[PDB]
Structure 1
Amino acid sequence: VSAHFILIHTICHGAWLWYKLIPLLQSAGHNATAIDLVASGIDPRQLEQIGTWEQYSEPLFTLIESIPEGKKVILVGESGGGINIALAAEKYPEKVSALVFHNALMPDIDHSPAFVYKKFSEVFTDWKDSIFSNYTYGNDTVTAVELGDRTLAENIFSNSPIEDVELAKHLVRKGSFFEQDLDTLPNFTSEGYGSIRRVYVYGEEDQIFSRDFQLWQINNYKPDKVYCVPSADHKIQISKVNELAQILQEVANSAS
């Protein structure tokens, strides 16, 4: 089995995050591609040039457009990246064989695309030393975050090697969830996002996405399969890559 995975990071993060996983997938025969979204990683744009999911997601869309024939990709989205892969599946359902959510926001079809994010914001507010800020983009004022050291070390990379905490500390950039724009979008549909195999992977020691919250997401719109990864934090791809690679192997096999 040879599959093409596209790996999508959350806000504030970037392609670099997937560094442990790419080689594992490639050793198993697969193609694994991680890209920077706009104003993320080393993308030269700045956040203020951007205020919408369509522009934030451009590089993912552009990439999927360039997939040939009736070939299909597996989209893997972590944390807030789940929204990105959901948009992509809604826009190019023919090109996606499976969606993998990785401690990720997993939308549904019965509610606004921002529903699942509003629930997270309602239930987690312990941002500690993270710095919030906002800016103007047309008629919207946009709220942005720079992730704090304690947030990285205690809540996100909570069970990863300290050197990965230190790595993130010199790489994370200002990010936003563009919530006004998200709320603005039409619900996902049965025939788009809803037509694709969805796999929910989560980490037993996630200190930002509670067990309660991730279970809520699973029950709110049941996926085709669920995996719990013992001892993993929010960043499975950093704290337990081998398990994550094992799981992704099965997803590839199951895709066909």
Structure 2
Amino acid sequence: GFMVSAHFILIHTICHGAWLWYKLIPLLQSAGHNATAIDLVASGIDPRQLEQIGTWEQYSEPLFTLIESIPEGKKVILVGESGGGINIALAAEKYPEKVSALVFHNALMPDIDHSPAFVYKKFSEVFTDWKDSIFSNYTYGNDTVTAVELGDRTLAENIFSNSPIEDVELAKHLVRKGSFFEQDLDTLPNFTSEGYGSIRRVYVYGEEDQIFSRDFQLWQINNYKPDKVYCVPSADHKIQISKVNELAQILQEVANSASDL
């Protein structure tokens, strides 16, 4: 039937890296898509350390650079997982002309009427069960920035809670210190209708996500209604790990829906 090939850019959440997309990339490529995963600053094997940045603008630079390399006339589908929802929204606001669709993968999905931090503050209000994760801080400019190193129990029980046990171990050896730069995020200008608000938004959630609850995710969906909502039975927070074929099926539908001449 009708099938098109698209270019996806896949964006990890804080503490994670391009490596997280290892299962999804070959599935997308097998169907003729171009799928690109990158490390954001101080993520994955990026050689910066977190203390060298304090803002979403700096953090997101690799994504903005990549988008600037897309040829005139061509567009990309941005897929953001968890906190990578904030990165793809920032990108959409900055380069709306380059983005055909946004796909939020159990992801923070900002709106236009409140501060960019609004959904993150709600998450932080509603989930506080951080277990053996370790919170620290560092100075960046005038600010004290809060950072987190994800605990083994957090990974196994909340994040990769229905993933193969070898994926929990992989994450253990790869996750790095991360921040949500809340002071920056909460003082940034609001996203706008003509920027981030102009792009088709698809919201995909995992039925068994043990860190972004069903109520939180439905709250985000109701807060800023997307164009389509997909659900993945039995998927945990890391759909691209726990139910990757189901994820790929959905991304194929998104490409088809995004398609144009």
Alignment-derived partner of residue 34 in structure 1: 37
SS in 1 for 2:110: coil
Measure the CA separation in 1 of the matches of 2:188 and 2:21. 29
CA-CA distance at 1:160 after TM superposition = 0.1
Deviations 1:189-246 (Å, cap 9, x if unpaired)?
0000000000000000000000000000000000000001000000000000000000
Alignment-derived partner of residue 44 in structure 1: 47
CA-CA distance at 1:9 after TM superposition = 0.0
Measure the CA separation in 2 of the matches of 1:221 and 1:252. 22
Deviations 1:82-134 (Å, cap 9, x if unpaired)?
00000000000000000000000000001000000000000000000000000
Deviations 1:26-57 (Å, cap 9, x if unpaired)?
00000000000000000000000000000000
Q: CA RMSD in A?
A: 0.3
SS in 1 for 2:174: coil
CA-CA distance at 1:71 after TM superposition = 0.6
Alignment-derived partner of residue 77 in structure 1: 80
Measure the CA separation in 2 of the matches of 1:138 and 1:191. 32
SS in 1 for 2:46: coil
Q: Structure 2 matches for 1:81-230, cutoff 5 A?
A: 81-230=84-233
CA-CA distance at 1:70 after TM superposition = 1.5
Measure the CA separation in 2 of the matches of 1:140 and 1:93. 31
Measure the CA separation in 1 of the matches of 2:115 and 2:76. 26
Measure the CA separation in 1 of the matches of 2:84 and 2:73. 25
Measure the CA separation in 1 of the matches of 2:142 and 2:61. 21
Deviations 1:153-184 (Å, cap 9, x if unpaired)?
00000000000000000000000000000011
SS in 1 for 2:202: strand
Unaligned residue ranges in structure 2 (runs of 5+): none
Measure the CA separation in 1 of the matches of 2:29 and 2:47. 28
SS in 2 for 1:175: coil
CA-CA distance at 1:2 after TM superposition = 1.4
Measure the CA separation in 1 of the matches of 2:73 and 2:190. 26
Measure the CA separation in 1 of the matches of 2:253 and 2:64. 26
Measure the CA separation in 1 of the matches of 2:67 and 2:187. 23
SS in 2 for 1:227: strand
Indicate whether 1:61 and 2:64 are aligned: yes
Alignment-derived partner of residue 251 in structure 1: 254
Aligned residues: percent identity? Answer: 100
CA-CA distance at 1:5 after TM superposition = 0.1
SS in 1 for 2:146: strand
SS in 1 for 2:90: helix
CA-CA distance at 1:150 after TM superposition = 0.1
Unaligned residue ranges in structure 1 (runs of 5+): none
Measure the CA separation in 1 of the matches of 2:124 and 2:59. 20
